[PDB]
Amino acid sequence: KHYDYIAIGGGSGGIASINRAAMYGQKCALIEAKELGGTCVNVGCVPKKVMWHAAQIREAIHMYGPDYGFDTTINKFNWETLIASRTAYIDRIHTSYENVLGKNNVDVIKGFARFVDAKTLEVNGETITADHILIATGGRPSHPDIPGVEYGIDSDGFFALPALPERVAVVGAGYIGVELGGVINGLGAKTHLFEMFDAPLPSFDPMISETLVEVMNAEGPQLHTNAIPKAVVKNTDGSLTLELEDGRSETVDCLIWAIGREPANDNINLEAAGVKTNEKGYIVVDKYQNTNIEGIYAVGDNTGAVELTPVAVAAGRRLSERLFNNKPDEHLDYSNIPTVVFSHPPIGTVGLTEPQAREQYGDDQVKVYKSSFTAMYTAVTTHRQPCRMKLVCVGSEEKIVGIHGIGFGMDEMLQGFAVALKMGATKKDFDNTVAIHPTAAEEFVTMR
Amino acid sequence: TKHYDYIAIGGGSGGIASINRAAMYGQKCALIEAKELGGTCVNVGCVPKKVMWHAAQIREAIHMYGPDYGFDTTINKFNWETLIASRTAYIDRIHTSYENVLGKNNVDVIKGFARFVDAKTLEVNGETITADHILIATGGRPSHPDIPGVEYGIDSDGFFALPALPERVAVVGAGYIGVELGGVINGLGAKTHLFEMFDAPLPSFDPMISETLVEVMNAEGPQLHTNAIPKAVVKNTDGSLTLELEDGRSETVDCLIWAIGREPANDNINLEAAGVKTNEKGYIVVDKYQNTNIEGIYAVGDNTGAVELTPVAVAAGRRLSERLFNNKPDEHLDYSNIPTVVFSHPPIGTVGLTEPQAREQYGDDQVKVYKSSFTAMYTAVTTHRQPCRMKLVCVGSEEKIVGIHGIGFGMDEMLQGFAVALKMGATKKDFDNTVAIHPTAAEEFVTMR
Ligand SMILES: Cc1cc2nc3c(=O)[nH]c(=O)nc-3n(C[C@H](O)[C@H](O)[C@H](O)COP(=O)(O)OP(=O)(O)OC[C@H]3O[C@@H](n4cnc5c(N)ncnc54)[C@H](O)[C@@H]3O)c2cc1C
Numbered sequence: 001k002h003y004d005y006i007a008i009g010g011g012s013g014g015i016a017s018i019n020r021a022a023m024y025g026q027k028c029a030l031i032e033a034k035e036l037g038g039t040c041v042n043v044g045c046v047p048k049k050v051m052w053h054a055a056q057i058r059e060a061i062h063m064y065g066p067d068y069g070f071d072t073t074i075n076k077f078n079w080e081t082l083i084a085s086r087t088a089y090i091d092r093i094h095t096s097y098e099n100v101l102g103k104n105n106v107d108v109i110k111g112f113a114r115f116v117d118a119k120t121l122e123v124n125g126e127t128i129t130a131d132h133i134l135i136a137t138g139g140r141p142s143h144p145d146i147p148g149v150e151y152g153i154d155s156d157g158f159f160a161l162p163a164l165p166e167r168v169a170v171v172g173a174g175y176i177g178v179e180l181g182g183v184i185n186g187l188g189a190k191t192h193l194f195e196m197f198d199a200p201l202p203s204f205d206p207m208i209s210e211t212l213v214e215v216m217n218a219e220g221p222q223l224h225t226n227a228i229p230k231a232v233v234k235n236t237d238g239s240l241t242l243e244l245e246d247g248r249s250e251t252v253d254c255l256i257w258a259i260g261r262e263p264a265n266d267n268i269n270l271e272a273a274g275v276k277t278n279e280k281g282y283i284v285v286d287k288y289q290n291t292n293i294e295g296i297y298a299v300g301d302n303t304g305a306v307e308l309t310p311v312a313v314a315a316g317r318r319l320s321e322r323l324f325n326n327k328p329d330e331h332l333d334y335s336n337i338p339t340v341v342f343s344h345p346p347i348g349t350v351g352l353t354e355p356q357a358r359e360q361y362g363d364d365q366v367k368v369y370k371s372s373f374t375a376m377y378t379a380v381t382t383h384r385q386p387c388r389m390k391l392v393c394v395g396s397e398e399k400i401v402g403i404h405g406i407g408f409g410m411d412e413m414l415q416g417f418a419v420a421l422k423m424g425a426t427k428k429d430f431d432n433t434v435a436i437h438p439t440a441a442e443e444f445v446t447m448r
Numbered sequence: 449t450k451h452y453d454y455i456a457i458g459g460g461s462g463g464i465a466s467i468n469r470a471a472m473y474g475q476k477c478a479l480i481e482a483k484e485l486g487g488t489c490v491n492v493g494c495v496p497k498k499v500m501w502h503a504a505q506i507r508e509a510i511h512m513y514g515p516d517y518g519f520d521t522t523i524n525k526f527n528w529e530t531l532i533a534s535r536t537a538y539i540d541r542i543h544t545s546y547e548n549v550l551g552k553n554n555v556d557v558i559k560g561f562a563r564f565v566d567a568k569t570l571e572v573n574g575e576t577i578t579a580d581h582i583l584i585a586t587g588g589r590p591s592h593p594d595i596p597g598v599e600y601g602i603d604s605d606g607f608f609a610l611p612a613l614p615e616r617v618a619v620v621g622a623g624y625i626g627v628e629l630g631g632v633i634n635g636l637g638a639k640t641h642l643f644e645m646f647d648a649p650l651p652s653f654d655p656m657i658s659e660t661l662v663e664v665m666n667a668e669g670p671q672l673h674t675n676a677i678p679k680a681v682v683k684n685t686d687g688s689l690t691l692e693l694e695d696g697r698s699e700t701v702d703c704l705i706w707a708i709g710r711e712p713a714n715d716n717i718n719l720e721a722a723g724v725k726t727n728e729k730g731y732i733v734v735d736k737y738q739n740t741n742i743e744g745i746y747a748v749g750d751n752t753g754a755v756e757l758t759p760v761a762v763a764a765g766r767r768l769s770e771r772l773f774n775n776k777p778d779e780h781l782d783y784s785n786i787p788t789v790v791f792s793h794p795p796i797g798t799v800g801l802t803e804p805q806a807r808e809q810y811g812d813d814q815v816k817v818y819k820s821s822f823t824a825m826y827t828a829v830t831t832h833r834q835p836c837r838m839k840l841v842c843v844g845s846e847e848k849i850v851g852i853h854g855i856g857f858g859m860d861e862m863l864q865g866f867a868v869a870l871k872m873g874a875t876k877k878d879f880d881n882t883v884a885i886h887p888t889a890a891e892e893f894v895t896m897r
């Protein structure tokens with residue numbers, strides 16, 4: 001069969017690019033080996049956020065509810081009910097995705113695709129060819145090469161758990177490990193988070209790492225830094241003992257590897273098409289998402305770019321604008337991409353951290369405004385939680401180049417502030433907007 | 449007589465904001481407050497309302513959403529006294545923070561009720577004090593209907609004084625205060641009725657917001673009764689109350705809260721001795737720079753009839769002290785594109801023109817509206833799914849954004865940043881060019897098509 005455009009991978013980048021191309025009169029096919037929606041819908045963004053909301057309910061019942069006057073007994077936490085509700089939601093999302101590709105007349109092929117040559121793919125015995133092929137294959141969890149690595153699960157296995165284990169160790173502490181440790185701790189398991197560096201989230205602004213250590217020490221999970229796994233022993237009673245290079249050990253019922261992800265570019269015969277990958281296995285692309293082979297493009301996690309769904313969606317849509325709607329310079333600017341981490345409490349960040357701004361512009365040019373306060377939701381309780389915010393400004397005009405915050409509300413407040421930073425907001429622009437009270441967000445327009 | 453550079457009558461949102469800013473420039477100041485520091489917002493407004501809204505959110509999490517997430521829970525006891533004690537201790541700590549800052553700024557705080565003796569002299573507690581500049585920031589108070597039985601109803605101040613939660617509650621007025629209270633009391637478990645005089649609640653807001661609110665109340669409570677014109681309140685033998693309406697409907701409840709409006713507190717301070725003019729509704733008339741008709745007397749806040757929000761009184765109060773005492777002769781507050789969040793169930797966020805307003809102003813042919821409707825993810829895995837609806841109102845070829853409106857979970861924290869972008873002259877292209885944050889409610893505004 002011949003197509004104008006084929007996308008390999010029905011995830012975030014693949015679906016977004018193919019739907020936009022289909023709007024410009026291109027005949028398109030989408031190939032997906034597993035479930036529509038990719039990592040984000042099935043084992044990523046969406047089930048993570050449902051589990052985060054379940055942890056927030058249990059914390060409202062058990063931790064904050066008593067000081068608001070609610071004496072409550074959780075008679076039973078039915079794990080199966082929560083998984084059933086979450087799974088039915090993902091099933092309705094699958095049906096909405098099929099409907100959109102359908103109305104767009106996109107051919108969806110369920111199967112694993114491999115290249116035959118630069119223009120030809122084989123999927124399920126059949127060969128298909130196209131003049132434009134997008135590789136959007138995403139990535140997969142990495143696992144350490146250590147004795148006993150197979151007794152641990154990774155984030156995909158977390159979403160398949162049949163019950164909540166009593167004692168859990170999460171190894172990594174990049175944003176996925178921090179998010180899962182916060183959710184599992186919040187749902188009531190005795191939880192340990194092992195971070196290999198001396199601080200969780202080390203590339204984030206230091207205000208964020210320092211505040212996360214504080215709430216973890218007060219509320220769990222139990223943080224262990226400078227922790228490099230050496231081995232995992234399975235014990236006769238069934239439990240697992242994690243052994244660290246430095247000598248520490250911990251016995252738990254479940255161990256989750258959250259050390260990193262690697263690109264799924266390996267079993268699709270890229271060598272035949274001639275596409276170059278780098279040392280880490282990522283497909284090398286230029287600013288326009290072109291590979292080294294004319295007619296083959298890549299977007300998403302398999303390119304080594306920041307691993308976020310909106311980034312794969314915008315790069316995929318802009319690619320179809322460039323190819324099919326005559327916009328030859330259309331492309332995604334990868335700077336100032338906003339990120340929210342659904343930790344406890346959530347983190348929101350966009351732009352340069354204060355060290356970054358200072359290295360790039362010199363201390364002389366950098367003015368930082370900071371706010372620290374207690375989240376109002378928690379202020380009436382014995383479980384007060386900090387909220388800390390930072391604006392990083394440069395020059396006499398105080399152009400805002402970085403906005404960072406950790407606390408309740410950070411997840412929903414950051415989007416409009418990232419529009420404003422994209423428009424080139426200065427501190428004066430923030431200060432001339434009237435505050436909304438009482439919110440955590442108004443702290444960013446009343447900093448002094 | 450003691451003489452000050454600047455005196456503020458009213459230690460609420462406007463008064464504290466303006467006096468602290470003047471004190472920072474070396475002005476010797478006095479602040480007069482008859483009751484508690486912080487005014488309506490700290491004591492019977494913004495702050496206690498939001499603590500009660502968090503309490504309703506926790507009860508809904510336990511009772512309404514929790515079961516579908518797998519939590520089988522028994523509320524063994526809801527101790528109203530614990531909640532009120534926690535709420536009150538927090539407001540007390542805020543009282544202390546304000547005294548600390550006022551003390552650091554060397555402001556003399558005078559506790560009592562002030563009245564004008566003439567245009568530059570005030571009397572408080574028998575003492576007479578004078579100043580070159582006097583700010584009147586006296587706020588407002590709950591209005592009450594003139595009908596038989598009005599005295600059996602309480603108002604929003606009385607709601608914050610309740611000794612216990614009543615079993616059946618009627619809130620009359622579905623302006624934003626009645627809508628908030630109706631949703632909080634219903635969320636805490638009481639049988640709640642909300643009576644609206646017109647066809648829909650929040651009649652001044654964009655129709656998309658009024659419509660979604662009706663749909664939510666129909667499904668979840670409070671019970672809405674529109675075209676409800678109060679005739680009388682009858683107290684029954686057993687002590688319950690029956691609200692009688694003009695059209696013949698009636699409703700028996702244990703507690704009835706009037707939330708029909710607020711009027712200015714400008715009437716007992718002998719404004720006529722100073723010569724300050726008020727309008728027909730009793731508000732002090734001010735120009736662009738908050739000047740009254742008497743040189744040296746200014747007014748800010750709810751008593752001027754400007755939009756009744758704490759941030760507006762704070763910003764107008766600070767910019768008035770900048771103008772008077774820091775040589776910014778043109779400093780003043782722009783009253784357009786002020787953002788509002790209503791802490792209803794679900795919350796509402798709006799800034800700029802409603803779609804009707806934009807169409808009258810620019811004409812139909814110039815207006816382009818984008819809308820998004822979806823289910824809040826928090827509720828989407830339960831049997832109590834709740835709508836989220838958002839609207840962008842754009843004008844002209846460039847699609848300059850002139851209104852941003854939404855109702856749904858997340859609206860309370862997401863609006864501030866979009867209001868900054870609106871003030872910056874954002875067009876829909878500026879929203880579209882920003883990468884989304886997933887999964888959030890807020891990303892819907894930068895992905896509308
Ligand atoms: C636990 C977790 C939480 C996350 N949470 C968030 C979050 O909250 N917000 C956020 O923005 N990002 C989040 N991410 C990141 C987000 O999931 C990814 O960045 C996004 O899914 C990447 O899109 P993609 O198109 O590159 O690949 P993917 O979405 O991974 O999709 C690739 C698709 O390709 C298919 N495939 C692979 N090879 C073939 C083949 N040869 N033939 C056919 N089909 C094939 C796969 O089956 C898969 O469906 C999270 C990731 C994880 C693991």
Ligand SMILES: Cc1cc2nc3c(=O)[nH]c(=O)nc-3n(C[C@H](O)[C@H](O)[C@H](O)COP(=O)(O)OP(=O)(O)OC[C@H]3O[C@@H](n4cnc5c(N)ncnc54)[C@H](O)[C@@H]3O)c2cc1C
Pocket residue numbers: 436437438457458459460461462463480481482483484486487488489492493494495497560561562563585586587588604625713717748749750751755756757758759761
């Ligand atoms: C139930 C409710 C909820 C609200 N929720 C919000 C919200 O969440 N967000 C928001 O932005 N706004 C909210 N508001 C509105 C906000 O409370 C007001 O807009 C704001 O308080 C007005 O500030 P002000 O300075 O004009 O007056 P006020 O805060 O009312 O203060 C005026 C002060 O003057 C004192 N006073 C009066 N006369 C004299 C006298 N002659 N001598 C001495 N002292 C005197 C009064 O005791 C009072 O303390 C709410 C209002 C109510 C009633």
